């Protein structure tokens, strides 16, 4: 059984999305859908996911951009891992 | 420092579409010679460049009055229009 | 120092062609440190980076010519290049003439000057190309 979340995608562009747009970026299993990415993220960090955009990368993986609700704080979440 | 009149008739030896270029060379050689300095030490102020290229790359003025100064420890020249 | 990247950002921030952006010669060092677009806007305000003006062709010489020609000059045989029918489309000219003649006849009729039957006789003659112009038609109407 493959997992949905592989690991946080941490790059300059990721941090900006984290500080300025309350978004977290993840490397995820390319078989995962936007919905499966949302669910998994909520269950792993106990947050509320608002929107998920995906992209199949030229690294053979799938990258997900997960925006959290205004109730949660990306900066603080990512900072505990 | 002195005012000199440089003849550029020898640029006619080079193909017409490139006279401006040869002019700028003759000017450097003339000053280097008449001020007893190396060509490498002669600095042409852009004013002179613009004067020679005024009518494009093929139409050079037949002469040009230039004001040049000579000095420094290594020996160099600074020239410009007048 | 190599500022070609800065030129690209400047062209975008100033919304102009790269060939029109101007970088102050005495500030290559500062422009060279400009990494972000924000760094570029900053230098723009400082005036270290500006946009050269674009030109537009003057139409003065054209306007004088237009006047001479609207006045009927500068169109002698030696100035024509196209065939006569190319200088003025003949069917197009006929449309102009025939419509003008029919409008004239139509006004004379509603006005009472012409009876529907005199109007018909003239209208059909116009359609047969009987009159060179409106004046020519009027001159005919006057018997």
């Amino acid at each position: 059984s493959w997992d949905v979340i592989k690991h946080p995608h941490v790059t300059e562009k990721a941090m900006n999305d984290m500080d300025f747009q309350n978004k977290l970026q993840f490397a995820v299993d390319d078989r995962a859908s936007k919905g499966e990415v949302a669910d998994a993220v909520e269950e792993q960090y106990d947050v509320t996911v608002e929107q998920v955009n995906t992209q199949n990368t030229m690294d053979g993986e799938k990258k997900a951009v997960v925006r959290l609700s205004e109730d949660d704080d990306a900066q603080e979440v990512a900072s505990r891992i | 420092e002195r005012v000199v009149t440089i003849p550029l008739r020898d640029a006619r030896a080079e193909p017409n579409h490139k006279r401006a270029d040869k002019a700028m060379i003759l000017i450097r050689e003339h000053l280097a010679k008449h001020f007893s300095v190396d060509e490498d030490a002669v600095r042409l102020d852009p004013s002179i460049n613009e004067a020679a290229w005024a009518r494009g790359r093929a139409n050079t003025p037949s002469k040009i009055r230039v004001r040049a100064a000579r000095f420094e420890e290594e020996g160099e020249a600074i020239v410009e229009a007048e | 120092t190599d500022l070609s990247a800065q030129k690209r950002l400047a062209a975008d921030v100033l919304d102009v062609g790269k060939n029109r952006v101007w970088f102050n010669p005495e500030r290559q060092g500062d422009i060279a440190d400009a990494i972000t677009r924000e760094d570029v806007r900053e230098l723009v305000d400082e005036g270290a980076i500006q946009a050269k003006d674009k030109k537009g062709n003057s139409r003065g010489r054209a306007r004088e010519r237009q006047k001479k020609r609207a006045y009927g000059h500068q169109k002698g045989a030696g100035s024509r290049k196209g065939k006569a029918g190319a200088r003025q489309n003949s069917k197009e000219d006929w449309e102009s003439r025939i419509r003008a003649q029919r409008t004239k006849l139509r006004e004379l009729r509603d006005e009472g000057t012409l009876s529907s039957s005199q109007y018909r006789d003239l209208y059909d003659k116009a359609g047969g190309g009987e009159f060179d112009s409106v004046a020519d038609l009027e001159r005919y109407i006057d018997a």
Partner: protein
Amino acid sequence: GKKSKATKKRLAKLDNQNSRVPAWVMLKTDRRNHKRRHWRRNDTDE
């Protein structure tokens, strides 16, 4: 062109294989990536 998801995975793999033999493998084996490919000089499959 338009690449499918699979085509894309293969292209990615090829890109990854196009890296160098890690420096430590040099020391360890005490002294080349024979499969080094260039986008221009070479031609990939498909």
